[PDB]
Swiss-Prot record, chain B:
This is N(G),N(G)-dimethylarginine dimethylaminohydrolase 1. GO terms for cellular component: cytosol; extracellular exosome. The active site is at H165, C266. It is an enzyme of class 3 (hydrolase). It comes from Homo sapiens. PANTHER family: DIMETHYLARGININE DIMETHYLAMINOHYDROLASE (PTHR12737), N(G),N(G)-DIMETHYLARGININE DIMETHYLAMINOHYDROLASE 1 (PTHR12737:SF17). Pfam families: DDAH_eukar. Disulfide bonds: none annotated. Changing E70A: Reduces enzyme activity about 1000-fold, and affinity for asymmetric dimethylarginine about 100-fold. Detected in brain, liver, kidney and pancreas, and at low levels in skeletal muscle. Gene3D superfamilies: L-arginine/glycine Amidinotransferase, Chain A (3.75.10.10).
Amino acid sequence: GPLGAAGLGHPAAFGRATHAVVRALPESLGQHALRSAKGEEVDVARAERQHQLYVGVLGSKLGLQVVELPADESLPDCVFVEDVAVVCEETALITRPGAPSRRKEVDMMKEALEKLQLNIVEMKDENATLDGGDVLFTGREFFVGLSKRTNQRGAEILADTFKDYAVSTVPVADGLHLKSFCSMAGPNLIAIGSSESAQKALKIMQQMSDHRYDKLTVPDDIAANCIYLNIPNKGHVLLHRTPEEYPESAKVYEKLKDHMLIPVSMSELEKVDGLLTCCSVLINKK
Amino acid sequence: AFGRATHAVVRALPESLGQHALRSAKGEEVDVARAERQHQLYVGVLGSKLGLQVVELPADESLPDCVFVEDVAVVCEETALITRPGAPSRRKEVDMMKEALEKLQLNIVEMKDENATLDGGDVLFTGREFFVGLSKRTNQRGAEILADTFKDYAVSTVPVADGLHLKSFCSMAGPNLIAIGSSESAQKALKIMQQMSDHRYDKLTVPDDIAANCIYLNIPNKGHVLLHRTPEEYPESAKVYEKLKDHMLIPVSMSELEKVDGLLTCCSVLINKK
Ligand SMILES: [Cl-]
Ligand SMILES: [Cl-]
Ligand SMILES: [Zn+2]
Ligand SMILES: [Zn+2]
């Protein structure tokens, strides 16, 4: 196997994926999806086009094998597959979402991950809730946001499932997920917002950790949600929000001269709090 | 982190071990030269291969059992309990082990109560709590003194069948992982231990009770390390250990010292110094 830390990537590198699971959005998303704040009307056709372009980046441009689950009109939030599963190595934790009406989304995700021959562990404890959006996996450990959607028991079950990794919790403000203001932008590199709320969470995370991470600080918390991938024969890749959406944050990502930067629009789904990480579950099948 | 260690205390075996060491059953003749080579290989794993600083105490021909240092001290974090062994004739071994642990700058607590006995072989430390076997060598008062010494950790007792120590059929094989034998006795003791603790331990069950005695270490730049008995000695138990794909497995022969009931944990005291 691999030794040392050199090179631009290999089949066991941090952020390597081979597969992605996504799910189409239903027409009912526009009116019936849950959302943290009143806001502008969702253009569902535009949201569909943006989702289609995002899937095209993962599958066509970057070469992942993409499993596209069909929309369910009775599950308006079903596009946000990250909340229903957390995958680490060959094990998939099927979560118990904090919003009870999203718990129906679990079935089809579990089916897809079984077909990919992952080891399946299910949250069934009636006292446990966990949204995948509250989970930051750094490659070395997990941080789990304690929010209105994820509680202490859910974090405990995650820690029981991925026993080989440290798990620590951090309080998250109401209406937010942990990854509403952070994500990994590269090996040992955490993208983080500049708000007092985001900085308070980062401090709690870094004081719980036995490691020192580097930071990529962006002026817009929402734009700290990005997707880092290590892609064969391409190397470090970063999907990030567009200059048209967050020009001041795009200026920061543009400094990453050793990344392949891919701007990806999410402006319509953001209206129902959908960001980049929310729309896929990434899997490394070795 | 569970299983961290920086130092080990061992003691050379005397020529007198062959005929004069205590043994629970008549059996084969001990090949003392072979036992010495096996002991040297064991010490080589701890010190040279794994990088522990090993304190090697000299043999005493008048103390035929002195190689079995585990029985005379229990070390938890910065505190050493110097035990009062159940076999009176082994109580002379205490002096030199106390001296060695003093030089390692440990806090020393001595079992001196004339009503108390405890062998270190009867003590299983899981990382979360202690289980203490009540055997022919370890009694209630000894276990109470251990609980008073390690006040940060829960302690519970479990009865052990005559002629055994608790770790004659169990030991820690990793974080939250108890290696355990399959005999009536072993499974009865395991059931009592689990009934006494809320914590759910994982089990590594082996068909040979003796092969459940192993040494787990967490070594920097290596990770999980496990010293276990060889396939030549216990092939059906080695097959169970070979399944631990995230452990660095180190087979270690102890066939000669097993004739005088000496297993893997018996021959060292492990210490984590910061
Ligand atoms: Cl667009
Ligand atoms: Cl990088
Ligand atoms: Zn989300
Ligand atoms: Zn012993």
